[PDB]
Structures are given as structure tokens and as C-alpha cells.
Design a binder for this molecule. Structure first.
Ligand SMILES: CC(C)C[C@H](N)C(=O)O
Ligand code: NA
Ligand code: NA
Length: 502
């Protein structure tokens, strides 16, 4: 089996997995919608009671499986629990990352396309009226991905966007095809440093922004000022947990796959802890100190929150660059912003494609080259669904990147810390660890975490089961139909892999 060359390379590879579009895009929005400081309390709690224990659990399961030549859940679940149903459940460890990757890579191609156009200097040129400053960039984004005037189902992506998406796919392949140590590890040792330093630079510059309407400092205050009146709102907790799962790449089966390349005897405790800690630093300190504080600076808190509630891409692809355009060298600043997003997204996109590749290599015994090329083909082909179908991206993000990851996180924990045995799991987690997990986390993993996730899922289902059936748009049923097709497709490959073994 292939392994990580150095401990450092391992750490930065995992950090590149977590730290991504979720930090500079999803987080600012989630925190803004949930009342800044009021969102932070549940967020931290969710990080302690959910993020860390699951992180360690996934690392353990990964290395455990990897030692026997299996990096994906279909096999690993079976190793932890003997049952056909264990394999069927493990199919999500492939379905989830694949579905998410389909649209994730596309968003990543956006940041790239933007990074290019902003570098060359081809951008809209605003003239004191907020709308007259934002409108040009709204039209700019809409022209790029091809957004309809009214609410129309079909998207018309510009040739440039499509070509950029091809390039993005190429870059992803060029990295993945070189292997774990030579391809992913090498890139991580470069991208991450660049990323952190670009992020750092952007946080400085942004913090310097101050206008008659507000300051970046007002934004930092808003984000870090505690509010206890929102603690009784379940929605805040649900959003916090969802963000923790997404940002830490938990429930995507990515962490597990990466961990399967860690040598049986190498530490996963301190490594895992360090990776997660880096992500949070990149999330709360970097991610939350760029977008929000800038919006608040120019438009004020109220408007900033309104803009955040407007959409997820509205703050990242429209508001921020529009704000930069009003400053000296704002065009170049916008470039660094999209270059940062691109490197963050690229480091994550490769991570959610690897689980599929690892399955083909491990279970179907395909060469790395073939495994990568076929994975890219599937993603690229499926991407047309997200590219040309409005609301398809949202549907995938929801079913896979929201519900799926939580459901899968609960499943893997139940299989590992319950069926497989709590003590055995604990012993497996701490084995070889440079430091040992606090004893208390034993009771967190076995009782607290699973219960909280279960309650969450129950609450969700109660609200969603009626809404699903009554949804007017056909694009979602097409998306649903197709991803269900993808699931069946993957189950069939597992069947073949199972048959080859015999
Ligand atoms: C799906 C995951 C790879 C997402 C990543 N953890 C992020 O924060 O963007
Ligand atoms: Na990343
Ligand atoms: Na992240």
C-alpha cells in the first residue's frame, strides 16, 4: 500500500482536505445568518463534542482499514462488522464524496475563472449608490455561470466557464495521478503555505478598511460578541453542527481514505488534532475576518447580514469584489481572493475524489492512472447536470453535503464504537498515538455524540419528509433520479468487487 512520506506532509495534506471553500465561503454566511457571536457558542461546542471525536474516529478507521489494504468504507465497514448490509451502508462513503465533488469542483472552476479574469483585468467597472456598485458584479457572475432572468430551469454557462471547468478537471487529475506522496503531499507542502499567507495578507488589508458607514472592526466585534438569546434556537445549533461536519470533511469518507495511507504504527491522535485545529484557525480567524468585516465596513452590520442571507455565493463572488473595486489596486486584491479560494477548493476537491480512486485501486485492482482517469470522467460527465440544471447544485449539496454527511457520521460511529466494540475502538484510536485522547472523550464518543446526532436527524426528517413530496420544480427530481442512479451504480461496483474476491 502507498503511504505518506513525512509527518509534515501528512498534516498539510489533511489540512488541505479540511480548509477549503467551506472556510472562506460557507462559514461567513452561516455565522452571519445565525447572529455572529450567537453562532459561535454552539459552533465551538459542536467542534468539541462532534468534530474532534469523529475526526479521531475516522482517522482510526482509516488507518485500521489501510493496514489491510482497504481505504474505503464498503470494505472497512465489513472489516468492522461482518454483514452484506455493512457493505451497502459503506456505499455512502463513495456516493457522498462523489456527489459533492461533482458540484464542488464546478464552484472551484468558478474561483479559477474569476482569478484569471481579475488577473488579466477583465472586470466590471463601477463609478456612491450600493446597487449601482453591486449590480455590475451581479451581472458579471450571472453572465459567467449563465443565470436566467426570471426563475427559469435552464442555465447557459459561457464558453469560458466551460473551458475553465475542463482546465480545473485537468489540474485535479495532474495532481491525483502522481499518487499519495508524490502528487497530493508535494502539492500540499506548497498550496497550504501560499494559502495561509494569502489569507493572512487579505486579513490585514481587509482590517484596514474603514468608511463613514462602518469599519472591519465593527464586523469582528459583531462576529465575536456573544449573544445568549439565540441559544434557545435549534436552527442555530443545527447550522453549527452542519458547518462543523462540512468544514472538517466529516462524513464524506475523505478523512478515512487519507488515513488509510497512514502507516499502521504512526500516530493519528496528535496528527488528527493538529489538522482539525489548523482548520478551525483557518475558519474562525482567517475566513471570518475577511468577508464579513469588509461587508460591514462598507454597508454596515444590518446590510451585511442582509447580503449574507441573500445567498452563499452573493458574499463571495459579488459583494466582496465590488467592495474591493472601490479601493486602490482593488482588482489585484480581488485576484488574490479568488486565487486563495481556488487553492483552498483544489486542496479539497482532490480529497473528495480520492475515495473513488482508492476503491478502484483497492477493490477493483485498477491501476492508479486508470482509476484517476475514470473518476475524472464520471465527475466531469455528471457535472453537466450541475452546469446546465438550475437548483441541481443545491439539491446535491443538501442530500449529500448536508443530510448525508450527518447520517454517515452517525453510522460510522455506531459501527466502530458500538458494534465493533467501544474498548477495541478506543484502544485502536490511542494505539501509536504521540499523545493520548483524554479519558472523558471515551464517554463522549460512546454516548453523547451518537445521541446528539440522532436527535438532530430526527428533527431534520420531521421537517423535510413533508416538503420533499411537494416540490414543484422538475430539475430536482432529475437530480434526485440521477444521484439515485449513481448510488445504484456504486452498489453494483461493490458487488463486482465482492465477486472478484471470491
Ligand atoms: C467536502 C469537504 C472537502 C469540504 C471542505 N472540508 C471545506 O471546508 O470546504
Ligand atoms: Na482545501
Ligand atoms: Na474546512
Amino acid at each position: 500500500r502507498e503511504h505518506w512520506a513525512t509527518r509534515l506532509g501528512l498534516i498539510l495534506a489533511m489540512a488541505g482536505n479540511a480548509v477549503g471553500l467551506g472556510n472562506f465561503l460557507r462559514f461567513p454566511v452561516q455565522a452571519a445568518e445565525n447572529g455572529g457571536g450567537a453562532f459561535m457558542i454552539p459552533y465551538i461546542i459542536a467542534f468539541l463534542l462532534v468534530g474532534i471525536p469523529l475526526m479521531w474516529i475516522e482517522w482510526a478507521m482509516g488507518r485500521y482499514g489501510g493496514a489491510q489494504g482497504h481505504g474505503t468504507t464498503p470494505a472497512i465497514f465489513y472489516l468492522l462488522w461482518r454483514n452484506r448490509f455493512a457493505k451497502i451502508l459503506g456505499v455512502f462513503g463513495l456516493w457522498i464524496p462523489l456527489v459533492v465533488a461533482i458540484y464542488y469542483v464546478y464552484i472551484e472552476s468558478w474561483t479559477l475563472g474569476f482569478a484569471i479574469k481579475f488577473l488579466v483585468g477583465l472586470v466590471p467597472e463601477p463609478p456612491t449608490d450600493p446597487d449601482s456598485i453591486l449590480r455590475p458584479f451581479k451581472e458579471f457572475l450571472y453572465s459567467y455561470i449563465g443565470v436566467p432572468k426570471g426563475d427559469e430551469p435552464i442555465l447557459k454557462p459561457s464558453l469560458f466557464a466551460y473551458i475553465v471547468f475542463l482546465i480545473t478537471m485537468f489540474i485535479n487529475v495532474s495532481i491525483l495521478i502522481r499518487g499519495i506522496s508524490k502528487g497530493i503531499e508535494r502539492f500540499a507542502k506548497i498550496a497550504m503555505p501560499t494559502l495561509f499567507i494569502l489569507a493572512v495578507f487579505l486579513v490585514i488589508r481587509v482590517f484596514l478598511l474603514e468608511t463613514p458607514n462602518g469599519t472591519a472592526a465593527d464586523g469582528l466585534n459583531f462576529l465575536w460578541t456573544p449573544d445568549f438569546e439565540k441559544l434557545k434556537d435549534p436552527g442555530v445549533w443545527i447550522a453549527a453542527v452542519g458547518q462543523i461536519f462540512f468544514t472538517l470533511s466529516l462524513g464524506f469518507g475523505a478523512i478515512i481514505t487519507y488515513a488509510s495511507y497512514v502507516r499502521k504504527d504512526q500516530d493519528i491522535v496528535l496528527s488528527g488534532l493538529t489538522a482539525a485545529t489548523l482548520n478551525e484557525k483557518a475558519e474562525v480567524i482567517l475566513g471570518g475576518s475577511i468577508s464579513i468585516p469588509a461587508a460591514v465596513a462598507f454597508f454596515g452590520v444590518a446590510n451585511a447580514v442582509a447580503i449574507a442571507k441573500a445567498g452563499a455565493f452573493n458574499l463571495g463572488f459579488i459583494t466582496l469584489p465590488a467592495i474591493f473595486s472601490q479601493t486602490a489596486g482593488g482588482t489585484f486584491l480581488g485576484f488574490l481572493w479568488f486565487f486563495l479560494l481556488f487553492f483552498a477548493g483544489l486542496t479539497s476537491s482532490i480529497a473528495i475524489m480520492q475515495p473513488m480512486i482508492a476503491f478502484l485501486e483497492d477493490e477493483l485492482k485498477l491501476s492508479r492512472k486508470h482509476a484517476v482517469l475514470w473518476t475524472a470522467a464520471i465527475v466531469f460527465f455528471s457535472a453537466h447536470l450541475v452546469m446546465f440544471l438550475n437548483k441541481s447544485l443545491d439539491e446535491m449539496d443538501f442530500w449529500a453535503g448536508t443530510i448525508g454527511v450527518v447520517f454517515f457520521g452517525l453510522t460510522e460511529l455506531i459501527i466502530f464504537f458500538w458494534i465493533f466494540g467501544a474498548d477495541k475502538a478506543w484502544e485502536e484510536i490511542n494505539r501509536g498515538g504521540i499523545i493520548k485522547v483524554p479519558r472523558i472523550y471515551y464517554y463522549v464518543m460512546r454516548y453523547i455524540t451518537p445521541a446528539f446526532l440522532a436527535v438532530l436527524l430526527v428533527v431534520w426528517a420531521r421537517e423535510y419528509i413533508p416538503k420533499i413530496m411537494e416540490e414543484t420544480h422538475w430539475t430536482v427530481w432529475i437530480t434526485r433520479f440521477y444521484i439515485i442512479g449513481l448510488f445504484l451504480f456504486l452498489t453494483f461496483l461493490v458487488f463486482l468487487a465482492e465477486r472478484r474476491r471470491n
